[PDB]
Each structure stands twice: as structure tokens, then as C-alpha cells.
Amino acid sequence: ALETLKQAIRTVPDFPEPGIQFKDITPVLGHPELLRLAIEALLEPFQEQEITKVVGIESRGFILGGMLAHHLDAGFVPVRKKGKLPYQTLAESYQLEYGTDTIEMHIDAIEPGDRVLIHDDVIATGGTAEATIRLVERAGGEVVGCAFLIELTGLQGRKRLPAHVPVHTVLQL
Amino acid sequence: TALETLKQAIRTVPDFPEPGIQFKDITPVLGHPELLRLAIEALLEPFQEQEITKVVGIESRGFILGGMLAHHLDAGFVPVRKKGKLPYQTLAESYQLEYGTDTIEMHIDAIEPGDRVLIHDDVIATGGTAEATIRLVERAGGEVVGCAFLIELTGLQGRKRLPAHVPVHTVLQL
């Protein structure tokens, strides 16, 4: 039971765009007792597993993503929306409900043989996490798993991800 | 000399984001577990025993080491962001650039009186953003125990822009 985490999550409708039922985890981030619980819960299924790199998906995935890398004595790799990373990148474009998005990762972020944990605060449709798995694999990384704080269960983002990747979600909202 | 290895790993990318800007890319430090460990240890050396309750990370690139600093210190983490980028109710600080103005924001429930706050960003350049961040934190009632930056662009003299009562620690001078 992780009720203290669940209770702390704020919903802000229409952020950053109308229609999005935004799950704001800043109340968790700001309280060390809850931050501790969140990190422990994210990491639990990955005990005693060699993790070389943690990928944090975009700005809000950098926050717990970095902590995970530090806690695991791993490197940290940012994956970003197109145009945000400074060095040469690999890119993946993907179809949305409406429109398309592109994410990128530095060409030297991941090396063949790296064991990689992919993190984001929230999985919604799973489109971004799917494309991130593709980036990591193109670089020769092996995806040990994805760890999300929150799954938006209604959207069934898990179904968008490939069968071969273990997916851990702490909260089902 | 461990620090010289950090220095050598920093990458400069010309003309990013806007032409003319000499971007300091810290991803080679972030990606290598040994360098990342050294970076965090160096940032925290003056601060480990200071009863810090909150670490502020300034914008996306400050969230990366910023979160690790909070986690390491058993402190809470607070994101500060450009205007409109945070979801909850905010307080805001506008500040002057060389051309025009910028505005940063923080959640109204992020910082309380009594909080002892460390402010982090990967790079300090003009110091405009960190100056405004100090103002935000202070208006919320926090005390800024210090700022910790990985990189100081000493040519831009950002230190001079920060108020004299706030200790400023930088790991690398570039």
C-alpha cells in the first residue's frame, strides 16, 4: 500500500493543453519522506540487477530519472523532444492520436551492451516510451525495464509497448 | 586531478540554441557513472553538513543533477521553471536580460519559512536566472544556504550579479 504517495498526487486539468488530465508529482518531490518512498518503489523490481544507464524521458522524467541513476551508480541519459539536445542525435518519429512527435538521444549516449532502465514520471499512451525503447535498442542498449511512477490505466499505454520489455508502474491512476 | 577529468569531459557545441552561444554540454559527465559520482561529490562538498531541507533545480537541465543533490541530502526537490511551464499555482519573478526580460516561477507550496535551500543549475552564465531564483526562494520564506553550479563561465562574471549574502560554489571554471 502506497496511499501516502497516491494522496499527494495533484490533478490539474487542461495542462499543458486542454483535455490533458495532468498528474502533478511535485508534492511527492518536495517531501523527502515521500520522495524516499517513490524511489524505493520505482527500484524494487530491479534489485541486484546490473544497470549501466538510466534514461529519463524529457524534463519531468529527468527529476526522478537522475535520482535513479545516482542510486544505482549508473550513468544518466536524457531523451528529449526534437531540437532540445545540443550534440548529434538519433531520432524517432511516431504517430499520435492527432499529429506526430519526434524524440532524440545523443549518438554517444548508449553503447552496445549497456543495460538500460527507462524512466518517466507518467506513462499515458505509451507512444513516447515505445519510441525511447527504439532509440536505446538502435544504440545497442538492452532494456532491462521501464519504471514509471504513474500509469494512466484508462489509456492502456502498456499495450503500446513491445512484449519483450518489462514494465513497472508504482501507481495506477 | 579527478576534477581535471571532469573538465576534459565537458563538450562545447557552437551555435546552440541560438547562433553565437557557446553551449556547454555536460552529457558526457552525466553518462559516465564515475564522472557523475565525482560531479555530485564536488557539488556537495561545502553543503553536506548544512541541514538543507530543499534543493531547487533551475529548469530542465538543472533538474538532472538537482534531483540527485536532493536525494543525496535527504532533502525535498523543487523545480523552478520559465513562465507557464509549471502546472500548479505559482509565484513569479521577472528579471532583465541584455535584450528584454524573462520570468521564472515556482509553485506557491514549494518552499516554507524556515526552509534551508540549496539552489542548483548546471551552468551559471550571466547569473540573471540564479539571481531571480534567490529572490523567489526568499519571498517564499526560505533561506538560501548557497548556490552550487557545475560550471561557472567566469568570463561572464555571473558571480557579480548574485547578492553578496549568498555563498556560491562552482566546481569548474570555464
Ligand SMILES: Nc1ncnc2c1ncn2[C@@H]1O[C@H](COP(=O)(O)O)[C@@H](O)[C@H]1O
Ligand atoms: N496526464 C498526464 N500527466 C502528466 N504527464 C503526462 C500526462 N499525459 C502524458 N504525460 C507525459 O507526456 C509525455 C507523453 O506521454 P505518452 O502519451 O505516454 O507518450 C510523457 O512524458 C508523459 O509522461
Ligand SMILES: Nc1ncnc2c1ncn2[C@@H]1O[C@H](COP(=O)(O)O)[C@@H](O)[C@H]1O
Ligand atoms: N554556454 C552555456 N551552456 C549551457 N548552458 C547555459 C549557457 N549559458 C547559459 N546557460 C543556461 O542558460 C540559463 C541562463 O543563464 P544565466 O545567464 O546565468 O541566467 C541557465 O539555466 C544556464 O544554465
Ligand SMILES: [Ca+2]
Ligand atoms: Ca552507491
Ligand SMILES: [Ca+2]
Ligand atoms: Ca500558470
